Every structure is written in structure tokens, then in C-alpha cells.
Amino acid sequence: SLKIAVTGGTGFLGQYVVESIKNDGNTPIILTRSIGDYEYRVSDYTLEDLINQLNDVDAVVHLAATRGSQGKISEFHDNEILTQNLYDACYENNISNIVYASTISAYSDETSLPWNEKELPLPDLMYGVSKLACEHIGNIYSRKKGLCIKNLRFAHLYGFNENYMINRFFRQAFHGEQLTLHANSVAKREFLYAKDAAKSVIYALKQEKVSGTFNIGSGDALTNYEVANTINNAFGNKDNLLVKNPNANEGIHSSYMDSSKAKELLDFSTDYNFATAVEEIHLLMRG
Amino acid sequence: SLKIAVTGGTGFLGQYVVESIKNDGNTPIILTRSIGYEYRVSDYTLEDLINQLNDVDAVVHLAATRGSQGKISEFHDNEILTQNLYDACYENNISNIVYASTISAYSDETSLPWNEKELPLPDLMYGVSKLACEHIGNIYSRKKGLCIKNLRFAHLYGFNENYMINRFAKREFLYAKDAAKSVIYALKQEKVSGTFNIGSGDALTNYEVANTINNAFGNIHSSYMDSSKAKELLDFSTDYNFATAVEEIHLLMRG
Numbered sequence: 395s396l397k398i399a400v401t402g403g404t405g406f407l408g409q410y411v412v413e414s415i416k417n418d419g420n421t422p423i424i425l426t427r428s429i430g431d432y433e434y435r436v437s438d439y440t441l442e443d444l445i446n447q448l449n450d451v452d453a454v455v456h457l458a459a460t461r462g463s464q465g466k467i468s469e470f471h472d473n474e475i476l477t478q479n480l481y482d483a484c485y486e487n488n489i490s491n492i493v494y495a496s497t498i499s500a501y502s503d504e505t506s507l508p509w510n511e512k513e514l515p516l517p518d519l520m521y522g523v524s525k526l527a528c529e530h531i532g533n534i535y536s537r538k539k540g541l542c543i544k545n546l547r548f549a550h551l552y553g554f555n556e557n558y559m560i561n562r563f564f565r566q567a568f569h570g571e572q573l574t575l576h577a578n579s580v581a582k583r584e585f586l587y588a589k590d591a592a593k594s595v596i597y598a599l600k601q602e603k604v605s606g607t608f609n610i611g612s613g614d615a616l617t618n619y620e621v622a623n624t625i626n627n628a629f630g631n632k633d634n635l636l637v638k639n640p641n642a643n644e645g646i647h648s649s650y651m652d653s654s655k656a657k658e659l660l661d662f663s664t665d666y667n668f669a670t671a672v673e674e675i676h677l678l679m680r681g
Numbered sequence: 682s683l684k685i686a687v688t689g690g691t692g693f694l695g696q697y698v699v700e701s702i703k704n705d706g707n708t709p710i711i712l713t714r715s716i717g718y719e720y721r722v723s724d725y726t727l728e729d730l731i732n733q734l735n736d737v738d739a740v741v742h743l744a745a746t747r748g749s750q751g752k753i754s755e756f757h758d759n760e761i762l763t764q765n766l767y768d769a770c771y772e773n774n775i776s777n778i779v780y781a782s783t784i785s786a787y788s789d790e791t792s793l794p795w796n797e798k799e800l801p802l803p804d805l806m807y808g809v810s811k812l813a814c815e816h817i818g819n820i821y822s823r824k825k826g827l828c829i830k831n832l833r834f835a836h837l838y839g840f841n842e843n844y845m846i847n848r849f850a851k852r853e854f855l856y857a858k859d860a861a862k863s864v865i866y867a868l869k870q871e872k873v874s875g876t877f878n879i880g881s882g883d884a885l886t887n888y889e890v891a892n893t894i895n896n897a898f899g900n901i902h903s904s905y906m907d908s909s910k911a912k913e914l915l916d917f918s919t920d921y922n923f924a925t926a927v928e929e930i931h932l933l934m935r936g
């Protein structure tokens with residue numbers, strides 16, 4: 395029975411991932427900078443400290459990160475550091491079965507859809523650049539420290555109980571209220587249910603000696619019109635959709651991935667699809 | 682005449698670049714952290730760089746840190762500095778920009794020769810951060826209409842430097858004078874943006890390296906790149922080969 399440490403364990407993804415671990419028979423150990431029935435271990439993400447917070451741990455899921463604000467590369471440097479510390483600490487304790495949470499935001503070139511992991515990364519955001527940097531940090535430790543880091547480029551995560559577009563619809567449709575879309579768009583964006591993302595963490599943790607980079611997508615690229623509709627139906631808010639302006643939005647770009655590689659090497663596929671996932675999220679918002 | 686700010690205009694490649702710029706007929710301007718050609722001391726804060734840059738027409742961003750610890754943190758400064766510099770450049774409507782990146786973006790021997798469509802695979806923190814600064818230049822190029830050209834240099838040798846080459850499995854070696862030339866040629870394409878491999882075609886095993894030097898004087902992993910893209914979109918190709926450049930370094934050492 396394995397002890398699995400989850401950085402950013404208390405986060406949104408983290409909570410899905412922690413329980414997937416417990417359901418798998420294993421033991422989740424939540425790492426966090428602070429708190430106010432799982433084991434929590436408080437840490438300051440220093441090398442010297444993690445060394446000790448990981449001394450009885452078998453695997454590590456590295457979920458902890460910052461989202462940014464200023465669009466400046468400086469807002470992420472603390473992550474990059476936190477990452478290298480973790481891998482340093484992992485090495486000391488002789489941990490190699492590690493999962494890193496990367497993102498679809500390593501891609502951008504619409505000419506190239508759908509993106510597979512041979513797509514030249516080309517981030518639009520400083521967030522992207524950073525994530526991409528932590529990926530190679532792991533890569534280097536993997537090739538040179540025999541660490542076994544599996545980078546997971548998650549598609550756009552959605553879940554239950556989270557002001558982003560998808561959350562707005564959830565809330566709005568839930569109170570029976572008109573969903574709006576600034577304009578119509580033809581752009582398609584891939585949405586991966588948090589439960590399925592925690593699933594892929596589990597399956598990647600199965601290939602304990604595997605090290606590489608995998609797209610974890612759902613299917614399953616939707617337009618904003620599609621998203622709104624599907625939420626609308628599931629929430630008894632049929633047809634309650636308003637398009638504020640005529641023409642194309644143009645503030646939105648397409649993003650989805652080819653997840654072949656994950657399917658064959660990780661033997662991974664999603665339990666849910668957008669409509670099934672939201673059917674369930676709805677049936678749980680009554681809390 | 683053109684006024685061309687050169688960060689790290691002080692260091693090795695800098696001195697070469699700075700003289701090329703003057704020779705091309707333009708006006709060099711070395712930015713530097715200290716004075717311990719027209720020099721301008723900056724602390725490379727955004728506010729400062731905006732002022733130090735408001736009469737400048739182009740920028741050769743060579744200012745960088747080597748790093749000793751193999752820690753990603755040692756390089757965070759180069760990154761902030763780079764973003765600032767580009768914010769500053771945006772403020773002064775400077776768009777023609779050349780970045781010193783490295784062949785160290787690549788690593789997978791299986792793909793040799795490496796071309797720009799090669800998946801990057803940094804082997805050092807040094808390279809990871811160089812890749813980071815590349816994408817900083819890219820995002821600014823696609824969004825704030827800068828025209829940043831990331832040059833991916835091969836390994837540089839020259840005149841007055843205790844590394845191996847200076848002390849006296851193939852590895853592409855680029856003469857600093859050729860590297861410089863490539864900065865000038867990149868600069869002439871003030872509208873172009875993107876990443877270019879700047880190599881010489883000179884992939885030498887350390888054996889050959891030693892030999893070539895012995896003759897012209899009297900006395901590890903494989904890395905080399907395909908540079909079709911530059912010879913094609915920048916008109917760049919090197920004047921010297923390892924043999925011809927050594928001959929010249931020799932002469933310059935007899936003074």
C-alpha cells in the first residue's frame with residue numbers, strides 16, 4: 395500500500411486527485427503551505443524541508459502552482475524553484491514515480507490542430523512559458539537523475555464547485571437564468587472533467603518507471619454555444635441562451651489535443667464526456 | 682546612421698558585435714551594469730531601460746548569466762531583465778530585436794542535424810531558461826508587434842577568452858566574428874521574427890579541433906545544427922571555417 399504525496403493537495407484538481415488515490419487503495423498525503431481525515435503535512439517548499447516531508451513517500455503528484463495576474467514571467471519563478479526543490483527532494487528520498495501537471499497552454503498554433511506531443515510548444519501566456527520550463531526541469535532530472543517524471547498536459551479542466559466562463563454558466567443555469575455569449579464563435583476548446591484528470595493521474599502512476607510527456611484530453615472540443623446548450627439542458631434551463639452581439643467574437647481561439655499516446659502507453663481513456671460530466675455536476679450542486 | 686543598443690555589449694560576443702555594428706556604418710551603444718563607443722550604465726529596471734533606450738533604433742540582447750549551481754533560480758534574473766527590456770522596447774516603438782539563444786536548446790542525438798522544427802530538449806538549466814527567454818520574445822512578437830529574432834548560436838571560440846578551445850563525437854563550433862556577422866544580417870531583416878539556427882557547418886570532434894590548431898600555430902555528446910533557415914531567410918552563411926578562423930586568431934596573438 396503506497397503513500398502518495400500530493401503538492402497543492404488542497405487545490406481544486408488536488409481534491410479530485412487525492413480521493414482518486416484513496417479510492418485506489420493507496421494513501422494520500424496532502425502537502426500544503428498552511429491549514430486553518432487525510433494526512434496533511436505542512437511545508438515551506440524548501441529543499442531542506444521537503445526532504446523530510448517526503449521521507450516515507452513512495453510517489454509524488456506535483457499539482458501545486460500559481461495562476462498569475464500581471465502577465466509577467468516573475469510571477470512564476472517561485473514555482474520553477476518549488477519544482478526543482480521537489481525533484482531534488484525526491485532524489486534524496488529516492489522517489490522516482492512522479493506526476494507533473496502541465497497544460498494544453500503549451501500549444502497555440504491553430505494551423506496545427508489537433509496538437510500531439512510532437513507539436514512545437516508555443517505558449518501565448520507567461521503561465522504557459524513557465525509550465526513548459528518546469529516540464530524540462532523534470533525532463534532533465536529524468537534523464538540525469540533516473541527520476542521518473544511523467545508530464546501531463548491537461549486540457550481545460552472543469553469540475554463541481556469552483557468565476558471563469560464555464561463556472562458562470564453552471565451557477566447561472568442553476569438558478570434558472572439567461573446564459574449569454576459576447577458573440578458567436580467557431581473556435582473549439584477541449585474540456586476535461588476533473589474526475590477524468592484525477593483518473594489519468596492514477597493510470598500514469600501505474601507506469602512507475604515510465605518518463606515522458608502526454609496530452610490528457612477528453613475527446614471532445616466544444617464551441618461556447620455547445621457548452622452553454624449542454625449546461626442548459628442538464629439544468630432544466632432549456633434554450634435560455636442570449637447572444638449579445640452579431641458576428642464573430644474573435645477573442646477566442648481553438649484548443650484541443652490528440653490523446654492517442656495517453657491511450658496506448660497509459661492505457662487511458664475518459665470515463666465522462668461533457669454532457670455526462672455536467673449531468674453529474676448538476677446532480678451534486680444540490681448541496 | 683542607426684543607433685543600436687547592445688546589452689552585454691561588454692562581454693565576449695559583445696565586443697565582436699559592437700565592432701561589427703560600427704563597421705557596418707552604424708552606431709553601437711553598450712548597455713552595462715557598471716564601467717568598472719558610447720556606454721550607458723543601466724540597472725536594467727523597466728523604468729531605467731525605457732530612458733536608456735529612447736533614442737535607439739534596434740537592440741542586440743546579449744546580456745546573460747552563465748550560472749554555476751545548476752539551479753533554475755540562478756537564471757530568473759536574465760528572464761525578468763529580458764521581459765523588462767522588451768517592455769522598454771515596446772515603450773519606445775523599437776521592434777527590430779536580436780536575441781542570443783543557444784544550440785543548447787537541443788539535445789537528442791537521434792535527430793542530428795537539428796533544425797528549427799526540432800522539439801527542444803534542454804540538458805541544462807542554462808538552456809531551459811534560454812528557451813524561456815525565447816518564448817518571452819515570441820509572445821511579444823505575436824501580440825505586441827515586436828520583431829524579435831531569436832538567434833540560436835553554436836559554441837563560440839575566438840580571440841582573448843580557460844575552456845578547452847582556449848586552453849589550446851562532433852560539435853559545431855562558431856567563430857565569434859561569424860556570430861557577429863549573423864547579428865548584423867538578422868538586423869537587416871527588421872520586419873522578420875522567429876527562431877534561427879546560427880551555425881558554421883563545422884562539426885569537429887575534439888581530435889580535429891586540437892589538430893587544426895597545432896598546424897596553424899606550429900605546435901561529451903554530439904551537437905551540430907542545420908542552418909538552412911538562416912541562409913535562406915536572412916542570407917547568412919559563415920566566412921570562415923574552423924581552419925581559416927584559427928589562422929587568423931594566431932596572427933592576432935602575435936601582438
Ligand SMILES: O=c1ccn([C@@H]2O[C@H](COP(=O)(O)OP(=O)(O)O)[C@@H](O)[C@H]2O)c(=O)[nH]1
Pocket residue numbers: 688689690691692693694695713714715743744745746758759762781
Ligand atoms: O544580469 C546581467 C546584466 C548584464 N550582464 C552583462 O553581460 C555581459 C556579457 O557576458 P559574456 O562575457 O559571457 O558574453 P558571451 O558569452 O555571450 O560572448 C557582462 O560582461 C555584463 O556586463 C550580465 O552578464 N548579466
